[PDB]
Structures are given as structure tokens and as C-alpha cells.
Amino acid sequence: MFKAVLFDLNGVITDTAEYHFRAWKALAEEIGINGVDRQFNEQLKGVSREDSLQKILDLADKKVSAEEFKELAKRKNDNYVKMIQDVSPADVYPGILQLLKDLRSNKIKIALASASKNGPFLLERMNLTGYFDAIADPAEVAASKPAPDIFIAAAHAVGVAPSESIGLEDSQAGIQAIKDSGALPIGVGRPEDLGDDIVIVPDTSHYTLEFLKEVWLQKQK
Ligand SMILES: O=P(O)(O)OC[C@H]1O[C@](O)(COP(=O)(O)O)[C@@H](O)[C@@H]1O
Ligand SMILES: [Mg+2]
């Protein structure tokens, strides 16, 4: 049997992409950059805080000091944090709470493999802290998804190898990170947003323990 499930946050447990988007747009508008719209934000989502800012700057051919850059990222983050203060248990994605209950009931480890440093605060706001055996710290890994580092760390933080793990992701960079960790990906959403040679479910109501076990057995050799 698998021993752990490694969860993405945004796209799987909940999704705060709207707040990330609004904070980025607000920052761009403050510094006088045109074109940070919903279509552009598709380039931003599965990208890090620093890489997101850089893309926005590049869009304007705007150069900043290293100090300026840190200040702009902080400003966006401070604004984003304000927006997520009202996140509640009602923002947990369909089926997720029951899955976390069933995993814990079966003594399968639960770990967060988010690229977001606001991950722990969001789990608290959704009242999910207690279910998480560990939270990989994206500030203590050498690279963001699609590097496998965060999934490797997530697995290790609960005492398992990725090979003994299922990863749950919603993005291309996320799916690739899981693959390269050696864990088994199951994607949620549309194929073109996920990747190939994986099991995909259309929405998180399909992530049940029964399904995860069946997929596990299908993928063992
Ligand atoms: O890995 P997840 O849970 O999908 O979160 C993805 C988000 O994490 C980030 O890379 C960084 O998040 P923070 O800015 O909250 O630290 C965002 O740029 C991206 O939208
Ligand atoms: Mg995601």
C-alpha cells in the first residue's frame, strides 16, 4: 500500500489563485505596468513569488534594484495576506476533508507539498492543521516546482520515500515535480493543465481513498 499522500495546496485543498492574481494586478498597477490580466496570470500561477514578479517586470522591460525587487515582492505578499484573512473551513475543496479523515483513519501519512509560504496559515484558517503530519517548507528547498525538491522534502518529513507516496497536483510544474520525485501523480483538472501518462480526475470529489488505492494497485509492477 502507499504510506503517504503529498498534497499540493492551491488547486487541491483549496484555491487562492484569485487572491494571488488580484494582489499581483494591484502591484503592477501601483508601479505603472500594463497587461497583468487574467490571461497573463496563466503564466504566473505555478511559478514562484520571485519568478512571478520577474515576469511582470519583464513584461514592461522594467529593471529594478535588488532592494527594490525584494520590497515589491513583500508589498504583494502583505496585500495577499490581508485577502486570505477570511479563508474558512467552507473553502476546503469538495471531498478533501473526507479524504483526509479516511487517510488518517488508515494511518496513511499526510504532508503538504505547497510552493506557498502562506501554506501553514491557510491550513489553520481551514481548520486542517491537525490532519497534517508535516508541511514541507518551501523556504528551505533549493528550487520550486517543477523541481522535485518540495515533494522529496514532504515525503521525508513524514518518514517515507516518494516511491511509497502518492502526489496530488493541479498544474504541469506540480505533476512534473511529483514524477521526478519518484512518487505516483494523480492530477486534478484538464489534461492540458496537468501532463501525460498519469491518472487524471476532473475534480477533487473524485479523490477518494478507494480510488487512490485502485490507482495504486494499477501502477504497481
Ligand atoms: O504550490 P501551490 O500550493 O499550488 O501554490 C502555488 C503558489 O505558490 C507560489 O509560488 C508562492 O506562494 P506565496 O507567494 O504565498 O509564498 C505562488 O507564486 C503560486 O501561485
Ligand atoms: Mg497548484
Author numbering: 1 to 221
Excerpt from the publication:
Allomorphy is a post-translational fine control mechanism where the catalytic rate is governed by a conformational switch that shifts the enzyme population between forms with different activities. β-Phosphoglucomutase (βPGM) uses allomorphy in the catalysis of isomerisation of β-glucose 1-phosphate to glucose 6-phosphate via β-glucose 1,6-bisphosphate. The active site of βPGM is located in a cleft formed between the cap domain (T16–V87) and the core domain (M1–D15, S88–K221), and these domains reorient in response to the binding of a phosphodianion group in the distal region of the active site30. Substrate-free βPGM exists as two distinct conformers with different activities due to cis-trans isomerisation of the K145-P146 peptide bond on the multi-second timescale. Allomorphic control of βPGM involves the isomerisation of the K145-P146 peptide bond situated within an allomorphic control loop, which leads to either fully active cis-P βPGM or partially active trans-P βPGM.
The ability of βPGMD10N to produce stable bis-phosphosugar complexes was leveraged to compare the structural consequences of partial allomorphic activation by F16BP and full allomorphic activation by βG16BP. F16BP is bound in a single orientation as the β-anomer, with the axial 2-hydroxyl group and equatorial 3-hydroxyl group hydrogen bonded by the carbonyl group of V47 located in the substrate specificity loop (V36–L53). The K145-P146 peptide bond within the allomorphic control loop (E140–I150) is completely in the cis conformation and the alkylammonium sidechain of K145 coordinates the 6-phosphate group of F16BP, which is aligned and in van der Waals contact with the carboxylate nucleophile of D8. The 1-phosphate group is coordinated by R49 in the distal region of the active site. The arrangement of groups in the proximal site in the vicinity of N10 and the catalytic magnesium ion (Mgcat) is broadly similar to that observed in the cis-P βPGMD10N:βG16BP complex (PDB 5OK129). Intriguingly, in the cis-P βPGMD10N:F16BP complex, the sidechain of D170 is rotated by ~15° in a planar manner so that the alternate carboxylate oxygen atom coordinates Mgcat. The resulting proximity between the other carboxylate oxygen atom of D170 and the carboxylate sidechain of D8 is close enough to predict protonation of one of these oxygen atoms. Notably, the interdomain hinge closure angle observed in the cis-P βPGMD10N:F16BP complex corresponds better with the domain arrangement of a NAC I conformation (cis-P βPGMWT:BeF3:G6P complex, PDB 2WF927, non-H atom RMSD = 0.9 Å), rather than that of the more closed NAC III conformation (cis-P βPGMD10N:βG16BP complex, PDB 5OK129, non-H atom RMSD = 1.4 Å). The transition from a NAC I conformation to a NAC III conformation appears to be obstructed by steric clashes between the carbonyl group of V47 and both the axial 2-hydroxyl group and equatorial 3-hydroxyl group of F16BP.
